[PDB]
């Protein structure tokens, strides 16, 4: 029932899991030394949110640089969402970026069957 709240740092993104709104938000860069230490709890929170109810989950991402292990961690989250979506769970994602090509976002989008908006600002 609790929210997820990871404060951002120079090398790790700020992450907010809003349980009641069914919103998972992330902002910043992600080049931690140990990405599963940072994202394991996020994967867990998403798993629990999907298991404890039927409400929709929305991801709102404002991620900048992602190192290799962070790319793998996000693919794991997206794969959880995709599995849930194929089961009929409403899932949607917004990927914000500043034009000043979102190539990584487009590659992730090709792996997802739920609405996945790549949005310049």
Author numbering: 24 to 123, 127 to 147
Structure paper excerpt:
Here, we show that the SiaABCD proteins play a key role in cellular aggregation and dispersal of P. aeruginosa in response to carbon availability in the environment. With our study, we demonstrated that the protein phosphatase SiaA and its kinase counterpart SiaB target the protein SiaC at threonine 68 (T68) and provide evidence that the SiaABC proteins make use of a partner switch mechanism to balance cellular aggregation in response to carbon availability. A partner switch system (PSS) typically involves a PP2C phosphatase (SiaA), an anti-sigma factor with kinase activity (SiaB) and anti-sigma factor antagonist representing the target for phosphorylation (SiaC). As such, that study is complementary to our data and strongly supports a model that the SiaABC partner switch integrates environmental information, such as carbon availability and surfactant stress, to control biofilm formation through the modulation the activity of SiaD through the phosphorylation status of SiaC.
To gain insights about SiaC, its crystal structure was determined in this study. Native crystals of SiaC were grown in C6 condition of the JCSG+ kit from Molecular Dimensions (0.1 M Phosphate/citrate, pH 4.2, 40% (v/v) PEG 300), with space group I222 and diffracted to a maximum resolution of 1.7 Å. Clear electron density maps allowed complete tracing except for residues 101–103, which are located in the flexible loop between the α3 helix and β5 strands. The SiaC protein comprises six β-strands arranged in a mixed parallel/antiparallel fashion and three α-helices. Notably, SiaC contains a putative phosphorylation site at threonine residue 68 (T68) and as such could represent the target of the predicted protein phosphatase/kinase activities of SiaA and SiaB. A hydrophobic pocket next to T68 is formed by residues L61 and L63 projecting from β4, W95 from β5, I71 and M74 from α2, L107 and F111 from α3 while L66 belongs to the β4-β5 loop. The hydrophobic pocket next to the phosphorylation site of SiaC is of particular interest, as it seems to be involved in the stability of the SiaA/SiaCP interaction. In addition, a large patch of negatively charged surface is present at α2 and α3 near the hydrophobic pocket, and could thus be useful for drug design as potential anchor points. In addition to SiaA inhibition, SiaC also represents an exciting target for interference, as it is structurally most similar to bacterial anti-sigma factor antagonists with little homology with human proteins.
